[PDB]
Design a protein around this nucleic acid. Structure first.
Ligand code: K
Ligand code: K
Ligand code: K
Ligand code: K
Ligand code: K
Ligand code: MG
Ligand code: MG
Ligand code: MG
Ligand code: MG
Ligand code: MG
Ligand code: MG
Ligand code: MG
Ligand code: MG
Ligand code: MG
Ligand code: MG
Ligand code: MG
Ligand code: MG
Ligand code: MG
Ligand code: MG
Ligand code: MG
Ligand code: MG
Ligand code: MG
Ligand code: MG
Ligand code: MG
Ligand code: MG
Ligand code: MG
Ligand code: MG
Ligand code: MG
Ligand code: MG
Ligand code: MG
Ligand code: MG
Ligand code: MG
Ligand code: MG
Ligand code: MG
Ligand code: MG
Ligand code: MG
Ligand code: MG
Ligand code: MG
Ligand code: MG
Ligand code: MG
Ligand code: MG
Ligand code: MG
Ligand code: MG
Ligand code: MG
Ligand code: MG
Ligand code: MG
Ligand code: MG
Ligand code: MG
Ligand code: MG
Ligand code: MG
Lengths: 14, 97, 87, 26, 179, 149, 122, 41, 206, 46
RNA sequence: ACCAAAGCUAGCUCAACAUACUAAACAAAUACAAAAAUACACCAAAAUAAAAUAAAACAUUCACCUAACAUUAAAGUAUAGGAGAUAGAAAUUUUUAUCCUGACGCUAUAGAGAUAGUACCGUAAGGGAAAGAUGAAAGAAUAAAAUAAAAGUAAAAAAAAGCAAA
RNA sequence: ACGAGCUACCCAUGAGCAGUUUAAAAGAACCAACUCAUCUAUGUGGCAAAAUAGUGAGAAGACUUGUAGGUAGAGGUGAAAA
RNA sequence: CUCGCACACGCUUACAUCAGUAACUAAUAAUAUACUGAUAAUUAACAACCAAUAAACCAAAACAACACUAAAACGUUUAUUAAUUACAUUGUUAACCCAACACAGGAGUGCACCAAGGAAAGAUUAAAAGAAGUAAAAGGAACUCGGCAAACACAAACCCCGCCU
């Protein structure tokens, strides 16, 4: 299938 | 692993306050009182644990029976989930069986 | 600044008109007749506590209206900023 | 703040050792 | 009469300006209703001048000369408003006996709360109003569970507060054993 | 008046009268160039053109001619220490023009005093002299000068 | 996205959305769309004459204060209506049926400024 | 009753005192020292 | 104007709305809560302006006048007795005006001084037959008057000159109220001769 | 063909889909308001 | 020698007692696109909870799982169950009042998520944090005291050959 | 429970298509704006969670496009690519 | 070297004046449309808000003369009513919006292609490899899966599968 793991974002407060 | 660098103020505990001197005074009320009050009628604490003992499952079941109708909504749900998990773990899991 | 008159800036087509297109042979004017609207009546000005404004409205209408008419006549004859006006 | 006194006092034995090494007594 | 917004020219450059005390509540009860009406505008012209000076101080980046004058005037305004209101409600009680000057009734909104619904002025009755007849004053059965949960939340907050007071009392006694 | 309930108006109702106005007016110096007849006021949000015209003509007896008003928006960008926006209040600015040719110029409310300016110069001069006296002598090489010998 | 935790005012929406900032209406729309401003609905400010009036926004510091006694509906009755009622009853002219002569008013709708409806703004 | 280890400073000092003369990161890091100390004995 | 304070706060002989306080305590910080023994308002017998005797510190047995009291932390500040020295005028190339500063003292280190014997004595509040709350000593048994102290405004009502915008005492105390049963709206309308004929229509409230 | 900008702002749509009026018109919508009031939300709805 | 280290309060947890249970604030505006004084209306509604699981599969069945009025016993008994898994009563019995309530519960990676449902990420339902440390006085900042102890670097780059050590 | 502000389709209400060739506004022809994305090369934690450069197909229609509304998961929608 | 002015939608003071930038923001420095503090501002004629009922009326917009098929948005007049009363309320800044970014992406209409708006190179040396562009002796597909790509070429014909857009 169309395997794809979307990226995540670091929390802005850091 | 850093430990504190200053000596804490030493706790001056008095062994002869009112609580410790009178601790366990009327434990023999039944023996020396014509058997009018069992020593279990001196326990102070929860309503469902005065003079009773059990494991975690029997304690949660007992709490639901006595004070179940007086508990809050959220506390009533959490108790039900605790009963179900303990029921499944004690009977359907373990080593000796 | 002119904004204190008040005047408000706007953007649309820039038109120079005389009442007819350039092909019209009648390129000059004789007279104009203007009618003040309801908002500029003498009675309205008195209620707004405006005494000297009665003559201001007449003068302001004539200066702006006649200049646009006379200016349009000159530019229909080819005269403009760099050619000035001969007659 | 960990409860207890043995850890707090035992380190005072170490602090004295470091001071002697840094500033030896006459 | 446009100079009333500014103080007299002799006092413009003064760094400190002295003023009397504000009107107390008791002093205004001895004045007549006609007297209070005239005193309100005397205060009104004073307050406008002080506000003008305060804003001008910020523009010039300089401190306002004796800023406590504005605090005195607004206190006088509130006292004048209070005493006239003390005459209005007292006269209303004698004539009608109603505590509040705006009609209203206790209603239960859709969220289950108890809300004091103030009334509004309309030229048509309640049943002929399109907008008013769309508002709902009653609680649906599903609101009962949510109303119960709000009681539990407030009970826990109060329970935590009461236990906090007990802990402080024990803590202070140990450090202050003067008993 | 503001924060009050006006009577609903129908046909034939009596005239609406307000005896103790709740409004307050600030007279401010214009930030830009303004004509000779224009006076700029800051008014509360619940004040209209007609209210301000009656406010000046009756309370202050100022013969105004035309009143124009606008609403100003305050800055809501700067953040608090806990990263919460703090919003400055929005204020309504109204410009009026006098009718009978009366001329108004905003006065200088903080004229400095020549004596006070001279006193400030003397105070500054005294401080400068005191600093010069307190300045160490370079030839002493940092040796304290309090001791005699 | 958009800020859901700010004040929703007229400046944020489209040209269609024009919400007032709190002013009180002073008219309606006429035939041609020109705003017909009703004279009655305009709040007529009433001002007294302060020229012959001697009073200042500040009070002297040496002036003593007084015991703070809030006005009571009972104290007002004993001050205004009680002397008239007391004299009439001693003279035998008291009438329990009609009390209009003492300042009591049965219905408020007759007078110009009601109390329970709170007709006057201020 | 939450029980926490407080003498952990002396727990790692009994190991690092035998690894003071090593080369690299084995004389500082505890995880790399124990494997080196155990092989040393 | 009243300034709101955080639920936990520390007092250091500076008013909350001062630049010195903001410099000491930024709005984004909060410190440890000091233990303060609760004293009810009816048990605080130390005021400002009465002579007191210092028991503990570098100076013992000396007497002085109380100038400031910190009710929040139970502090009494004598006038220049328990003093430490600091500098005030500070700049790049000059320092000076060495001004002594007085450190705070707790209530337990300060005992009120009776006027007659000039010795420290315990004080208890007593209710006399005159209805006034007067402090009463324990040893000598003599009452101590309240320490009348000038207010923070610095203005003495005894010596005052009325300004242009000051109301005279005679007019302030002049009574003109005639208590009739007409509201302020009715009285002013008939005073100026404002006449109104028509009446409002029926308005429905809901 | 370049996703990521699925949100095209519009005040007419935002106030009609997630507005306070719509939340109070459906029985399920009112429960959404009740849940957010119980949780302590600063903004119940747009 | 840098980076760092240490502190004990904020408050919380579990009960008990207990009034009897949607707090605080409501001047004005709040279900027009909420917080916008003001026009001929429509208004409203209910239908058994299901399944993940257990029976080593899974179809009948699977405690608690919305509504019990409790405790000591009768009893895990009679019965109900692809009679398998497991489910499970009653008749009949026992229970003397108020005070004695506090802590072999935690101490900032713990205890509530909380300094807070706030920042912030989502169109929306929803998810949801990290963050405090001087002293009696900082109206003692030429200010003071304390460990100088984690990894990482500096003081001080390296000299044939080897699981780095013995 | 919440989602059709992207996308599939539809209902409203609007707005675009210049020149050139032909009795033609003919799902004709050449070629822009505009809309799709054929081939190759860069790019591959990149400018970009699908782009840039060159080159291409349609370009008066079964065409593009703005605003706003409707259909919701045992479903919606689909000139079937599950 | 050339995507420029304005409106709608959106964002919400990020705009303006003065001062400061050791550090925070700009992926660097100068510095300030973008970071900090103080003060100030968008003024209505344009735009939003801006009557009801009954009756007469089969006859398209495309320069519309008159026609085509797919049969088409776009109202006037008569009658009965409509508070009649200067000045109502609201939007007016910007270098901006949606894409985690001060992103080579996405973005409707009117009028221009400029009179307007902007800067491809921080300073050097001129190695390999890689990307983009120009030119070439003799030969002109001998390359290669294929004439892919490139070209001073920009043509002709056959077949298979679908009729065609
Ligand atoms: K088991
Ligand atoms: K929709
Ligand atoms: K890009
Ligand atoms: K913005
Ligand atoms: K081949
Ligand atoms: Mg305007
Ligand atoms: Mg958001
Ligand atoms: Mg708008
Ligand atoms: Mg706009
Ligand atoms: Mg008008
Ligand atoms: Mg997204
Ligand atoms: Mg779109
Ligand atoms: Mg199974
Ligand atoms: Mg298994
Ligand atoms: Mg089940
Ligand atoms: Mg059978
Ligand atoms: Mg925590
Ligand atoms: Mg911990
Ligand atoms: Mg280290
Ligand atoms: Mg070797
Ligand atoms: Mg759509
Ligand atoms: Mg064409
Ligand atoms: Mg074609
Ligand atoms: Mg391309
Ligand atoms: Mg290309
Ligand atoms: Mg090429
Ligand atoms: Mg083509
Ligand atoms: Mg073709
Ligand atoms: Mg839905
Ligand atoms: Mg389907
Ligand atoms: Mg399709
Ligand atoms: Mg197929
Ligand atoms: Mg398939
Ligand atoms: Mg943004
Ligand atoms: Mg830059
Ligand atoms: Mg500058
Ligand atoms: Mg700035
Ligand atoms: Mg970037
Ligand atoms: Mg460049
Ligand atoms: Mg370079
Ligand atoms: Mg090369
Ligand atoms: Mg070439
Ligand atoms: Mg060649
Ligand atoms: Mg070949
Ligand atoms: Mg070959
Ligand atoms: Mg091939
Ligand atoms: Mg090719
Ligand atoms: Mg073949
Ligand atoms: Mg085909
Ligand atoms: Mg064929």
């Amino acid at each position: 299938k169309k395997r794809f793991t979307p990226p995540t974002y670091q929390p802005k407060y850091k | 692993f850093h430990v504190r660098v200053t000596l804490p103020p030493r706790k001056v505990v008095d062994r002869w306050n009112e609580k410790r001197a009178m601790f366990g005074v009327y434990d023999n009320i039944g023996i020396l009182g014509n058997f009018e009050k069992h020593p279990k009628e001196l326990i102070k604490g929860p309503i469902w644990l005065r003079g009773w003992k059990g494991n975690e499952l029997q304690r949660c079941i007992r709490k639901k029976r006595m004070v179940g109708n007086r508990m809050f909504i959220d506390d009533l749900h959490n108790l039900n989930k605790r009963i179900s998990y303990l029921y499944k773990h004690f009977n359907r899991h373990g080593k000796y069986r | 600044k002119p904004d204190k008159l008040p005047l408000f800036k706007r953007q649309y087509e820039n038109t120079i008109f005389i009442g007819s297109k350039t092909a019209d042979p009648l390129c000059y004017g004789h007279t104009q007749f203007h009618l003040l609207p309801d908002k500029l009546k003498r009675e309205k000005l008195l209620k707004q506590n405006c005494a000297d404004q009665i003559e201001v409205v007449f003068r302001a209408n004539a200066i702006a209206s006649l200049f646009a008419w006379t200016g349009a006549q000159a530019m229909y004859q080819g005269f403009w900023s760099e050619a000035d006006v001969t007659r | 703040a960990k409860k207890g006194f043995r850890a707090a006092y035992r380190f005072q034995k170490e602090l004295e050792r470091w001071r002697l090494l840094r500033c030896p007594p006459p | 009469g446009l100079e009333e917004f500014f103080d007299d020219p002799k006092n413009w450059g003064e760094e400190k300006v002295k003023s009397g005390a504000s009107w107390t509540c008791q002093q205004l009860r001895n004045k007549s209703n006609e007297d209070l009406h005239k005193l309100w505008y005397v205060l009104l012209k004073e307050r406008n001048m002080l506000l003008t000076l305060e804003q001008e101080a910020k523009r010039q980046r300089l401190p306002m000369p004796s800023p406590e004058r504005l605090e005195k005037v607004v206190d006088s305004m509130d006292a004048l408003d209070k005493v006239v209101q003390e005459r209005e409600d007292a006269l209303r009680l004698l004539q009608t006996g109603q505590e509040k000057a705006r009609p209203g009734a206790w209603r239960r909104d859709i969220f289950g709360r108890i809300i004091w619904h103030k009334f509004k002025q309309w030229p048509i009755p309640w049943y002929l109003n399109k907008k008013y007849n769309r508002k709902r004053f009653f609680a649906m059965p599903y609101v009962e569970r949510f109303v119960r949960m709000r009681i539990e939340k407030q009970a826990r907050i109060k329970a935590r507060k009461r236990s906090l007071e007990r802990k402080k009392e024990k803590f202070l006694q140990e450090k202050f054993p003067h008993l | 008046a503001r924060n009050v309930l006006y009577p609903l108006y129908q046909l034939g109702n009596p005239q609406l009268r307000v005896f103790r106005t709740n409004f307050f007016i600030q007279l401010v110096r214009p930030g830009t160039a303004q004509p000779e007849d224009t006076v700029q006021f800051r008014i509360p949000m619940e004040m209209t053109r007609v209210d301000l015209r009656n406010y000046l003509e009756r309370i202050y007896n100022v013969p105004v001619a035309a009143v124009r008003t606008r609403v100003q928006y305050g800055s809501n960008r700067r953040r608090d220490h806990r990263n919460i926006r703090i919003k400055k209040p929005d204020y309504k600015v109204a410009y009026v023009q006098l009718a009978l040719g009366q001329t108004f110029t905003f006065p200088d409310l903080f004229p400095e005093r020549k004596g006070a300016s001279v006193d400030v110069d003397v105070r500054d001069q005294v401080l400068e002299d005191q600093r010069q006296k307190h300045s160490p002598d370079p030839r002493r090489g940092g040796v304290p000068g309090w001791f005699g010998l | 996205g958009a800020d859901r935790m700010s004040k929703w005012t007229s400046k944020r929406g489209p040209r269609t959305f024009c919400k007032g900032r709190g002013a009180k209406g002073t008219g309606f729309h006429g035939r041609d769309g020109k705003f017909v401003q009703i004279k009655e609905m305009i709040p007529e400010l009433v001002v007294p004459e302060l020229a012959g009036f001697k009073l200042k926004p500040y009070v002297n510091y040496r002036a003593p204060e007084g015991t703070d006694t809030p006005l009571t509906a009972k104290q007002l009755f004993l001050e205004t209506a009680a002397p008239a009622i007391e004299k009439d009853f001693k003279a035998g002219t008291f009438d329990p049926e009609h009390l209009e002569k003492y300042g009591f008013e049965p219905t408020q709708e007759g007078k110009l400024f009601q109390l329970y409806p709170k007709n006057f703004p201020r | 009753l939450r029980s926490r280890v407080t003498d952990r400073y002396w727990r790692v000092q009994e190991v690092l005192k035998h690894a003071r003369h090593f080369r690299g990161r084995k004389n500082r890091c505890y995880r790399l020292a124990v494997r080196a100390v155990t092989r040393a004995f | 104007s009243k300034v709101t304070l955080p639920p936990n706060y520390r007092y250091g002989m500076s008013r909350p709305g001062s630049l010195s306080d903001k410099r000491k305590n930024p709005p984004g910080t909060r410190r440890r809560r000091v233990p303060v023994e609760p004293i009810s308002d009816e048990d605080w017998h130390l005021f400002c302006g009465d002579k007191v005797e210092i028991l503990e510190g570098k100076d013992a047995g000396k007497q002085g006048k109380v100038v400031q009291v910190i009710r929040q932390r139970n502090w009494v500040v004598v006038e220049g007795l328990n003093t430490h020295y600091r500098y005030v005028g500070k700049t790049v190339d000059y320092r000076g005006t060495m001004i002594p500063s007085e450190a705070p003292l707790l209530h337990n280190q300060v005992k009120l001084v009776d006027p007659t014997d000039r010795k420290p004595t315990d004080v208890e509040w007593r209710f006399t037959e005159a209805g006034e709350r007067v402090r009463v000593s324990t040893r000598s048994g003599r009452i101590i008057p309240k320490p009348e102290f000038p207010r923070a405004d610095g203005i003495v009502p005894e010596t005052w000159i009325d300004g242009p915008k000051d109301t005279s005492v005679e007019d302030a105390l002049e009574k003109t109220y005639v208590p009739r049963l007409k509201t302020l709206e009715e009285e002013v309308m008939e005073a100026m001769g404002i006449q109104e004929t028509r009446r409002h229509k029926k308005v429905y409230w809901y | 063909k370049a996703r990521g900008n699925e949100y095209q702002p519009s005040n007419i749509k935002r106030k009609h889909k997630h507005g306070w009026v719509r939340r109070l018109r459906t029985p399920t919508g009112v429960q959404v308001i009740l849940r957010r009031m119980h949780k302590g939300r600063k903004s119940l709805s747009h």
